[PDB]
């Protein structure tokens, strides 16, 4: 979706943009982890540092990363166009990601889509008439083990139902953050049946191990 | 025992990873060099 | 015609909706189809006689 | 000047001769009278380029973009 | 003394070590059809037309960037060799629209010659055929980025020999646009030497653009002037 | 040998599936980690290589190539250029979770595994490539490495032994294709994620130009217990070639879908009805089975009545076995819609080096959309058979073959349902 | 299907139908088709000269 720059100022360098010297010390740690000789490989962590500084990134962020990492910026434009984290459009504060591919659609994701729609109001893919409620549906996030899943900003949410969805949207309006895990009890990815897994606290290194 | 001994990550804010990267940067072998410092230096 | 788009140009509807039709059309009317190296004779029964082409 | 064509006093400019080897070109041009300019033939120069030799550790050949 | 035996169509030939399959097949006279390879550019594995079946290896392997172990038999005229070539030519002609009249490299395209001499005859795939908004590289080079087959030959030449670094891949899937993200002129030295590198008619000369075609014009030897190189 | 095997406890691979004792270097020490391993490292790493090659540790991550032969290729004579170990932890192939629970509960066994692997091949550092979607468990892994360096038993003069070794975490940025063999490597390089060609191997030219290797979470996590447990008695779990345990997880469509450790040889019916609740609607209700994440053709009911969950039986059933999605889907839904959703997934996450996967995934997207709307004649379903015979074995990576296979699953098993959907749209047109 | 006058056409409420692609010169067996083509400032490609020898036409 519009993979050319197409300026529209509040963009179009030099946009006013700069970091914190504390963040520059973070950058020194980041290019201290990597070996010298191939110093330019830290484009992805430095640009994600820019993304978590400013939730959307302008092009002057990419020019600043080119200044710090001394390479021509076209590599940075490649990386910014390539991946999926780097939301190059200006979006709002909180960010809804409704994951649905293979188990998630058959575990009633359309009720989840309709719940997000008829509570939030705005159509899918768009934003809201302020910030902080940008909605996208996405492909697999990895946590396939449960209900069609919700990622808000570095927070996973499983075992969904429309009443819990209304709870989550009400608590976003009140600002209080829910738990970082699923719902319907089961504090981790559990067999919700009758403890089919290991039960007992194990022995350890004590029994017969082959020379160890 | 049937109790969630995690939730230490309950409130890890978005700079905790990078602060921890700064915390773990020292006591480390010197990240070996090879000739140039960059292919365009 | 034949079952080969490398000898005769294809017809109009496929020429307006293909890609291979336009490619074979264009090269078949600029270069023409290539002919393997060989010396043939034939002669058919024209009403005047053996019309031979070598 | 009536049309805008290309008229010429060149009967021989439309000729071209396809030969197998240079020796018979020399022999035929010496046989049929007119002089000739032999320009030489240049091969595609064999170069040694390979993938792992392009993506090494210390050499400056490093594409940095693919 | 540094010789490797390859059997091309039964004929044995000794090859210097470290080279490619393609250099051996061109040494014995075969031209394996190719798009992404070029003798002055480093090799990528994009265009896939280089395929050939070596015996007893059921994966048909790429020959643009194949190192040469000892004792090969390389068959360029087997069955699945021809099937692989017909397949890749069947895939390339979807997202490259009908422009061979109004194109500028009609007489000397590469898709057209290789689609005659290697490709198919009757296509498939009714719908499709994505479109790309055109770019503005510079007022010396006319650019239509719809005919681009994403062959990835211009970017390697830019980043190696030109070094101007204003060309890049963008995006994923079918939607991979080759060009400048940031609406900037590519005006440098040898910027005119991209119109002959680009193997399809997507990058052409600006002032020449719509005059002639490569059959009416006749060739003549001449010398580089206004320079000291020649 | 074994009478087809079943579950057994205290010979389980990892402890603490959920909510056990603590999360601590001392807690893992009490459970059996970090235990006397200097004598493991100083018995001789070539003995560790012989232990791996003798124990028969099957490689994981959707490949099936053996671990021992690969790490035997990882014993190149050392140059000035060092060697790197790279632990992939990207979580692709929906029906995915094989390492999220591990990397949250016990990362210390992964740390000891990559330490043993780095001493095994003369490596010097272990880069752990985590998917970027995982800030919480990534920070948990960071606190694990923090406590490991704070105890100081790894790092420099590690385990009381003169062998330095470090462990780093590099985040992803969200792509299925980062999980592969060499697009991983160039994702470390700072370039955009795109693989390289295979006959120049990553075991030969790898991370920036050093010979390196890449392994899955599960193989590295079992790798300390392969050293500190019984050789060939780990191989007492299952059949001859495919041996050891595997995380068989129903992610998807049963009552209470979940994850269990099981042996290699296990009946699929026992796996479904005896380890994850029950089937929604009973055993008669289920339409089909997919193993292998999502890079694998589907399996109907009549095949899976007898074919137990094993690599040899699944490859003879024209399928590849992977992780966490060994699941059924119901008769009540459209498996055509599910497969077209999977093709939309493979379109949304793919790079465009190879023209075959790009153009073929384009064609299969539009054709499967027209099949969900039933908009063709059976020449088109045979055409889809043609395109899946031509994509197979023409690409760089394995995503092209992984996109080719579900078409073949649908055609080989659910032909008359396709015919009836096309006849329904024929009656709608008529 | 008689072959007569050598007339051109134009689009329905539109432009000249020829786009100067020289195929008629490439198949004209006595080369009566003579084309010299130039574009214009609009963007669409065009001609300058499109001529036929009625001597050399053979229908
Ligand atoms: C298409 C593709 C997808 C892959 N996805 C994953 C994945 O989700 N997680 C993972 O850890 N490895 C993944 N891998 C890598 C495999 O684990 C592969 O076996 C690896 O390159 C070597 O690991 P091994 O030690 O198990 O042989 C993937 C590889 C390919 C080609
Ligand atoms: S690039 Fe080739 S195939 Fe494309 S329009 Fe031009 S001549 Fe035709
Ligand atoms: S612009 Fe031309 S050279 Fe560049 S990728 Fe496209 S077809 Fe290839
Ligand atoms: S098959 Fe597709 S995703 Fe894989 S390397 Fe080739 S172009 Fe990229
Ligand atoms: S150049 Fe000739 S063949 Fe082409 S559009 Fe014009 S009249 Fe037709
Ligand atoms: S001779 Fe006449 S009918 Fe024949 S191609 Fe030429 S202009 Fe057309
Ligand atoms: S598909 Fe929704 S979590 Fe993997
Ligand atoms: S020649 Fe282009 S892929 Fe080998």
Short mmCIF file of C-alpha atoms in Angstrom, two decimals, chain E residues 62-188:
data_model
loop_
_atom_site.label_atom_id
_atom_site.label_comp_id
_atom_site.label_asym_id
_atom_site.label_seq_id
_atom_site.Cartn_x
_atom_site.Cartn_y
_atom_site.Cartn_z
CA UNK E 62 20.58 -23.63 -11.28
CA UNK E 63 23.49 -23.26 -13.67
CA UNK E 64 24.17 -19.55 -13.41
CA UNK E 65 25.94 -20.06 -10.08
CA UNK E 66 26.85 -23.73 -9.91
CA UNK E 67 30.43 -24.57 -8.91
CA UNK E 68 31.99 -27.45 -10.79
CA UNK E 69 32.83 -30.63 -8.90
CA UNK E 70 34.79 -33.33 -10.69
CA UNK E 71 33.25 -35.45 -13.41
CA UNK E 72 29.90 -34.04 -14.45
CA UNK E 73 27.43 -35.08 -17.11
CA UNK E 74 25.27 -32.07 -17.96
CA UNK E 75 22.30 -32.72 -20.27
CA UNK E 76 20.73 -29.60 -21.76
CA UNK E 77 18.28 -31.58 -23.91
CA UNK E 78 16.47 -33.90 -21.49
CA UNK E 79 12.74 -33.94 -20.77
CA UNK E 80 12.37 -32.10 -17.47
CA UNK E 81 14.97 -29.56 -18.60
CA UNK E 82 12.57 -28.55 -21.37
CA UNK E 83 9.65 -28.80 -18.94
CA UNK E 84 11.37 -26.48 -16.46
CA UNK E 85 12.15 -23.94 -19.19
CA UNK E 86 8.57 -24.06 -20.50
CA UNK E 87 7.34 -23.66 -16.93
CA UNK E 88 9.44 -20.60 -16.08
CA UNK E 89 8.50 -18.98 -19.39
CA UNK E 90 4.88 -19.81 -18.55
CA UNK E 91 5.26 -17.99 -15.23
CA UNK E 92 7.05 -14.86 -16.48
CA UNK E 93 4.40 -13.84 -18.99
CA UNK E 94 1.66 -13.16 -16.45
CA UNK E 95 2.74 -9.91 -14.79
CA UNK E 96 4.12 -8.25 -17.91
CA UNK E 97 1.33 -6.62 -19.88
CA UNK E 98 0.64 -6.30 -23.60
CA UNK E 99 2.87 -3.52 -24.84
CA UNK E 100 5.01 -5.02 -27.65
CA UNK E 101 3.77 -2.50 -30.23
CA UNK E 102 4.29 0.61 -28.08
CA UNK E 103 7.42 -0.77 -26.46
CA UNK E 104 10.78 0.60 -27.52
CA UNK E 105 12.76 -2.63 -27.40
CA UNK E 106 10.36 -4.65 -29.50
CA UNK E 107 12.89 -5.79 -32.07
CA UNK E 108 15.50 -6.71 -29.45
CA UNK E 109 13.62 -7.83 -26.40
CA UNK E 110 14.77 -10.94 -24.59
CA UNK E 111 11.38 -12.32 -23.56
CA UNK E 112 10.29 -12.47 -27.19
CA UNK E 113 13.29 -14.30 -28.64
CA UNK E 114 13.43 -16.71 -25.74
CA UNK E 115 9.66 -17.20 -25.80
CA UNK E 116 9.90 -18.29 -29.41
CA UNK E 117 12.98 -20.44 -29.13
CA UNK E 118 12.27 -21.96 -25.73
CA UNK E 119 8.82 -21.05 -24.41
CA UNK E 120 5.21 -22.08 -24.81
CA UNK E 121 2.50 -21.56 -27.41
CA UNK E 122 -0.83 -21.35 -25.53
CA UNK E 123 -0.97 -19.55 -22.19
CA UNK E 124 -3.28 -20.05 -19.20
CA UNK E 125 -4.39 -17.85 -16.29
CA UNK E 126 -7.31 -15.63 -17.35
CA UNK E 127 -7.25 -12.87 -14.71
CA UNK E 128 -4.30 -11.16 -13.04
CA UNK E 129 -1.62 -8.88 -14.48
CA UNK E 130 -0.89 -6.30 -11.78
CA UNK E 131 0.06 -2.71 -12.61
CA UNK E 132 2.65 -0.34 -11.15
CA UNK E 133 2.63 3.47 -11.04
CA UNK E 134 5.44 4.83 -13.19
CA UNK E 135 8.61 6.34 -11.79
CA UNK E 136 10.71 9.39 -12.62
CA UNK E 137 14.35 8.31 -12.60
CA UNK E 138 15.66 11.27 -14.55
CA UNK E 139 15.01 13.36 -17.66
CA UNK E 140 17.66 11.43 -19.61
CA UNK E 141 16.19 7.96 -19.04
CA UNK E 142 12.57 7.15 -19.81
CA UNK E 143 11.12 4.74 -17.28
CA UNK E 144 7.99 2.61 -17.29
CA UNK E 145 8.08 0.27 -14.30
CA UNK E 146 5.21 -1.89 -15.48
CA UNK E 147 7.26 -3.84 -18.04
CA UNK E 148 9.88 -4.57 -15.35
CA UNK E 149 10.20 -8.31 -14.83
CA UNK E 150 12.05 -7.74 -11.52
CA UNK E 151 15.08 -9.43 -13.03
CA UNK E 152 17.45 -7.65 -10.60
CA UNK E 153 20.21 -6.68 -12.95
CA UNK E 154 20.17 -2.89 -12.66
CA UNK E 155 20.55 -2.78 -8.87
CA UNK E 156 23.77 -4.81 -8.81
CA UNK E 157 25.33 -2.65 -11.53
CA UNK E 158 24.29 0.48 -9.62
CA UNK E 159 25.59 -0.62 -6.21
CA UNK E 160 28.84 -2.01 -7.61
CA UNK E 161 30.03 0.13 -10.50
CA UNK E 162 27.91 3.26 -10.21
CA UNK E 163 27.83 3.43 -6.42
CA UNK E 164 25.17 6.13 -6.54
CA UNK E 165 22.89 3.85 -4.47
CA UNK E 166 19.53 5.25 -5.56
CA UNK E 167 18.00 1.96 -6.74
CA UNK E 168 16.44 -0.60 -4.45
CA UNK E 169 13.99 -3.42 -4.17
CA UNK E 170 10.90 -2.45 -2.22
CA UNK E 171 8.18 -4.73 -0.94
CA UNK E 172 7.34 -8.39 -1.11
CA UNK E 173 5.30 -11.02 -2.90
CA UNK E 174 4.12 -9.93 -6.31
CA UNK E 175 4.47 -6.32 -5.17
CA UNK E 176 8.21 -5.79 -5.51
CA UNK E 177 8.96 -2.40 -7.03
CA UNK E 178 12.45 -1.69 -8.30
CA UNK E 179 13.40 1.95 -8.03
CA UNK E 180 13.92 4.97 -5.82
CA UNK E 181 11.66 5.22 -2.80
CA UNK E 182 12.24 8.89 -2.18
CA UNK E 183 11.40 10.70 -5.49
CA UNK E 184 14.96 11.65 -6.36
CA UNK E 185 16.86 12.13 -9.61
CA UNK E 186 19.41 9.52 -10.65
CA UNK E 187 21.68 11.92 -12.54
CA UNK E 188 25.27 10.73 -12.57
#
